[PDB]
Structure 1
Amino acid sequence: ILAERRKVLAIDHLNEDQLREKAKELWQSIYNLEAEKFDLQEKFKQQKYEINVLRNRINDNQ
């Protein structure tokens, strides 16, 4: 699956221009995956906080 999200990179038939295009599109994909990573990190931090509170209530509930 890591291999599946490892997309196909075909850069032989691409001349210099389509090489620039492929490099930039891979860069943009990197940017978007960094975006999802940061969002899931913020969600996970809010989650760890709320789970601190949840175990607080658990101690209060049991």
Structure 2
Amino acid sequence: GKRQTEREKKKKILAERRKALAIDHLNEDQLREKAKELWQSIHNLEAEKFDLQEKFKQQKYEINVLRNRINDNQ
């Protein structure tokens, strides 16, 4: 199933992004490092999502341009 394939692939990516958060055995400094890793990952995802938002705004405006030209080309 192509839709099944999409759902399965997205869930696979979801699973992959789930790193092994098995770390209590670490000491204080290592766990602080891991927390910073998570924090930096979150901030980078924030940057990625902001880029997605601005690119979506651009895509919507360009689709408006496209529809304008379509109407012009009656």
1:8 to partner: Cα distance: 2.0
Q: Percent identity?
A: 97
**Per chain length, whose mean CA-contact separation is higher, i.e. which structure has more relative contact order (CA < 8 Å, sep 6+)?**
1
When the two structures are superposed, what TM-score results if normalisation uses the length of structure 2? 0.75
Which 5+ residue runs of structure 1 have no aligned equivalent?
none
Which 5+ residue runs of structure 2 have no aligned equivalent?
1-12
Q: Runs ≥4 in structure 1, deviation > 4 angstroms?
A: none
What count of residue pairs does the alignment treat as equivalent? 62
1:17 to partner: Cα distance: 1.2
Instruction: Name the CA distance, whole Å, in 2 between partners of 1:6 and 1:57.
Output: 45
Over aligned residue pairs, what C-alpha RMSD do you find?
1.2
SS at match of 1:54: helix
1:47 to partner: Cα distance: 0.8
